[PDB]
Symmetry: C2
Subunit: 456 residues, 2 copies
């Protein structure tokens, strides 16, 4: 049981000028090394305050790690505070003097003025593989790191040996629960009691996903207790509470979709057909010549995901940035605003927004890009004009002439939903609230008393 406390010295973080990113790194790294972090404290550049906090933490924890305040200016007073807390006196340390002298050493006198009882630790910068400029100063069980975030990460990585607890290795499991915290709290209490000291079970909500509301976290020093509690909980919790959620969209999406295609299942065959059409799309036109019609709904969501999967594997070496065509005609829904920005961010899309009917946007697009010659469409066999549609249907004479590709032409509503949910693809949350179609504000209603249970 090796514990540690952290003291971050910085006026700026308290003021709000800059955000604190050192604390997350320090905590994560120390967790990996086998050290239990018990407290964190942000304090201003004041000698008395820093000295009090150092004294308390030193008495209470095995290791103490301070970040910031060892500069050459007047506001840098960590060394002085550490001197005070331990009744030491500040003295120029010859080796730090030599370090400053090897370089320019103008006005660096304060950088070598450290507590008399200090000890130096030399290490290797992981980025350069060469030794650091200055060694790490320690006093009793207090290690004085710099505040510069890049340098802090480098120095901690270089000197992490100093903190490794060999006796302890931490093992952790994550679980996604679709129920709110209130419903499962009793089961968690019972499980924690039954297991007691062996493992720590915690819970916290994370709000922005279609597949879980709460995240359970299991922690232990050994691997076994984690699975034992997994079994206990899978039993106690109602069946299906847990979700095997994976971040797929960005990278695994390519191979995950292809795997679903090669599987011998109905949905697998539908995916295989859509992907064959999309591959032909890539073979007739350059991607600079293709664009995906995206209104925000599911059909367009699935189309975009399939196009991404196909593009990646077909064209890994080329940058292949995705282009989409977005039409607004009615005052956007709030959920739609959020989803559209999120989607373009995830996929790194190119939005050429015309506002009106699709044909109008198509004219605008012909104007903006002379190379574009074809549009991918999420039209389907359930959508009217269904008998006339072909996988490749050319644009009407009046409209601006583009050749439309309909990979999802034979896909059915049930298939769209199976495909989206099985791979955990994100979609507009309104669908989860009982709306079967995303339309204008006057157009939208809920037919059920989720959307993915409606049969037709």
């Amino acid at each position: 049981s090796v514990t540690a406390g952290i003291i971050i010295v910085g006026d700026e973080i308290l003021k709000g000028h800059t955000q604190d990113t050192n604390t997350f790194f320090l905590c994560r790294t120390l967790r990996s090394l086998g050290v239990q972090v018990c407290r964190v404290s942000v304090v201003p550049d004041e000698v008395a305050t820093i000295a009090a906090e150092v004294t308390s933490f030193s008495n209470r924890f095995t290791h103490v790690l301070t970040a910031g305040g060892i500069g050459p200016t007047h506001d840098d007073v960590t060394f002085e505070a550490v001197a005070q807390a331990f009744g030491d006196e500040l003295k120029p340390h010859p080796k730090l003097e030599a370090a400053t002298k090897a370089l320019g050493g103008e006005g660096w006198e304060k950088l070598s003025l450290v507590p008399s009882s200090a000890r130096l630790h030399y290490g290797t910068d992981p980025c350069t593989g060469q030794p650091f400029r200055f060694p790490l100063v320690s006093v009793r069980n207090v290690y004085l790191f710099p505040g510069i975030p890049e340098l802090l990460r480098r120095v901690l990585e270089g000197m992490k040996g100093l903190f490794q607890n060999p006796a302890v290795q931490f093992h952790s499991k994550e679980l996604y629960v679709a129920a709110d915290e209130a419903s499962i709290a009793p089961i968690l209490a019972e499980a924690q009691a039954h297991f007691g000291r062996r493992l720590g079970l915690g819970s916290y909500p994370d709000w922005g996903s279609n597949y879980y509301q709460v995240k359970l976290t299991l922690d232990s020093e050994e691997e076994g207790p984690l699975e034992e509690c997994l079994a206990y909980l899978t039993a106690r919790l109602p069946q299906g509470s847990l979700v095997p959620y994976m971040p797929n969209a960005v990278e695994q999406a390519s191979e995950a979709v292809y795997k679903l295609a090669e599987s011998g299942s109905s949905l697998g065959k539908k995916v295989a057909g859509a992907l064959q059409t999309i591959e032909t799309s890539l073979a007739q036109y350059s991607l600079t010549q293709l664009c995906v019609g995206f209104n925000g709904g599911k059909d367009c969501t699935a189309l975009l995901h399939l196009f991404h999967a196909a593009v990646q594997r077909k064209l890994p070496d080329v940058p292949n940035p995705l282009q989409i065509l977005y039409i607004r005609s009615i005052s956007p829904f709030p959920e739609l605003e959020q989803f559209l920005q999120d989607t373009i961010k995830r996929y790194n899309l190119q939005m050429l927004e015309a506002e009106g009917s699709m044909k109008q946007a198509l004219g605008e697009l012909q104007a903006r890009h002379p190379q574009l010659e074809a549009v991918l469409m999420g039209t389907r066999r359930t959508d009217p004009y269904s008998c006339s549609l072909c996988p490749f249907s050319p644009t009407d004479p009046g409209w601006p002439a583009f050749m439309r590709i309909n990979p999802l032409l034979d896909w059915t509503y049930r298939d769209i939903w199976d495909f989206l949910r099985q791979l955990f693809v994100p979609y507009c949350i309104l669908y989860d609230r009982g709306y079967t179609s995303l339309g204008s504000r006057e157009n939208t209603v809920r037919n059920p008393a989720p959307a993915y249970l409606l049969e037709n």
Copy 2:
């Protein structure tokens, strides 16, 4: 003098599972309101520890703001901790009971079990305009916020009136100094003494810039002292320490480049000519047909900047990412690779990678991209082959068929460096370290002329000395 302490509750934050973002929002918000935050504290889900910190912060500071631990599980124990801290007893507050009963209220009894001395503060959620689900719980000068960052931001926005200090207004301003921290340390000490408690002066280094090393920070309740200190320091500090640097190398570059072109100066004329060639390029081919040859160096940096300005002027609508072709030295420098990575995000470029001879990379490209037909080049007329070169030159017969466009043909080394620095365009750090020309690792060395512990590249006064390194 309204002071505030902050207590962040949650084991997960400490273990490293998740990062804490509540603290930045709380600190920024409280400063905007006129409240000085004196401490922040992260504590585990333990009653004793939370209660100790609560007692301490309450006795010492005007406001105490707690985030987390008011959930319905057992590991959430803020209410009980506060009860302990003030010797109070937990008793259900009927209004919170009515709230929990209004909805299903399954397992929500713990959400209505608060200290007997609790006070409720009702508000309205700024996103929905609807009243909050639950009110903000207060005990003494201790305010119990939820832990979910989205919901906490909503709640703080709704009820921030509770903390507004009318007596105080904060003024803050930052300065960019091209000097090491040690050199200005004495001047900063003297200025701070001279101003005493009128104004608060801090300094911190910022590492990723070609134009400044340190950032000075002035904080006060009035504007006058800030301007006074600006004058004091501008006088005390050696000349040129202060720089009017602005991070508009991309958004405002469009207007700036053309402004410099319209100037009747040697450099202005050079920029106008390069831009004329580039505009002609855009008039001949579509952007899908163009790409910028970019090796990371100075010439390509300036070329990309000019090309960007021209594109944003003629086609402000066209969002297309500009395409660039990168050739990798048999042994690239790491710093140059990093600068190229930083650049691809700055300008949002699309990279058509290729290695080997220019001829080889072009052979691969015409396969990867058939639609592409022309390449912009940062070549300059140093050697005779380039003096023979023309602005629009096709590739030799052997090479693959592309049209090379050389807008920078007549530019001189001094002009390149002036164009980059005057507009504060970012460039590879290696040039500042004494390299005047970046080639493969085994061929290039810090330029000896620039040694004295090496001087920047943009001070070398002779253009011919750049060529030898």
